[PDB]
DNA sequence: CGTCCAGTCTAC
DNA sequence: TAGACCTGGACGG
């Protein structure tokens, strides 16, 4: 997912796990080529927070949980299929690659990182990816100034629809969002990134990088609401994959949707 | 059946 | 920077 999806996953984990207590190890699937999670505790709480296209879990042991241990942080990137589900222990989904198990008393559940295509990754540190810009959702001012302050970067030589996927500057923006953001302002996709941004030294392209993802979060759904959780989202799209929209391929063969003028660098 | 389509991460 | 990395759904013979 993109920014809003990671945000909604974080919200789901905090809400679902709020009154749960986990115990045991953190079981990785043998099939998953991500790291073993070396954590085990008689009783620990799980919480989440998001930043752009990253999600941090914190495993926090209870007072007197054994063994004595500091809380452990994990950072996930979801790839294309990543997600969290809370299921009964005995009905793990296909492709649950990392599982955390509730501790009795009560229904024996499993919080699962589910990732069909296995593009999602997790790291033991708790650190955000160095290089990643500030979050378009929760760090708008930082995000905005990081762009305007660095227009001389080679990244802004690229056309705008290519620049918007640079997670050094648009941490959280992915394919549907660049399409929907550009369509709101009718900015040609293959306009030169530096040229579109020097025009602002009216909601503008950088406000919309904040406000458009925020519209998706405020919708809810996407597996964290209530596959009809996607009804609203499908109806909310104005561009991405819509009848009578144009669509090219950027230099990395990613599909950009737009109306009218492709712009000078197609 | 068959083929094509849907964000990094790292080796060249 | 391409290509590699993966599964399943959507769409066509």
Residue numbers in the entry: 2 to 202, 222 to 246, 250 to 289
Question: What does the paper behind this entry write?
Answer:
Human endonuclease VIII-like 1 (hNEIL1) is a bifunctional DNA glycosylase of the Fpg/Nei family, which catalyzes the removal of damaged bases and subsequent incision of the newly generated abasic sites. Unlike traditional enzymes which are commonly referred to as highly specific biocatalysts, one special feature for hNEIL1 is its unique capability to recognize a wide range of substrates, including formamidopyrimidines, hydantoin lesions, oxidized, and dihydro-modified pyrimidine bases, derived from all four canonical bases. Here, by integrating structural, computational, and biochemical investigations, we show that hNEIL1 uses a triage mechanism to achieve broad specificity and reduce futile repair of normal bases. This mechanism involves two mutually competing interaction states: an activated state that commits catalysis and BER, and a quarantine state that temporarily separates and prevents the flipped base from catalysis via auto-inhibition.
Despite the very different chemical structures of these substrates, they are recognized similarly by hNEIL1. The damaged bases are fully extruded from the DNA helix and inserted into a relatively loose binding pocket, which allows the accommodation of substrates with varying sizes and shapes. One edge of the flipped base points towards the protein and forms close contact with the side chain of K242. Noteworthy, across all these structures, we observed an unusually short distance (~3.0 Å) between an outwards heterocyclic nitrogen atom of the nucleobases and the terminal nitrogen atom of residue 242. Based on the similar overall conformation and detailed atomic interactions, we conclude that such a tautomerization-dependent mechanism may be a general strategy for hNEIL1 to recognize not only Tg but also 5-OHU, Sp1, Gh, DHT, and DHU. Oxidized substrates of hNEIL1 are often bulky and contain non-planar structures; this disrupted aromaticity is expected to diminish the π–π stacking with Tyr244 and hence destabilize the quarantine state. Moreover, it is expected that the bases with less solvent interactions (e.g. DHU) would favor the formation of a stable quarantine state compared with the hydrophilic bases (Sp1, 5-OHU, Gh, and Tg).
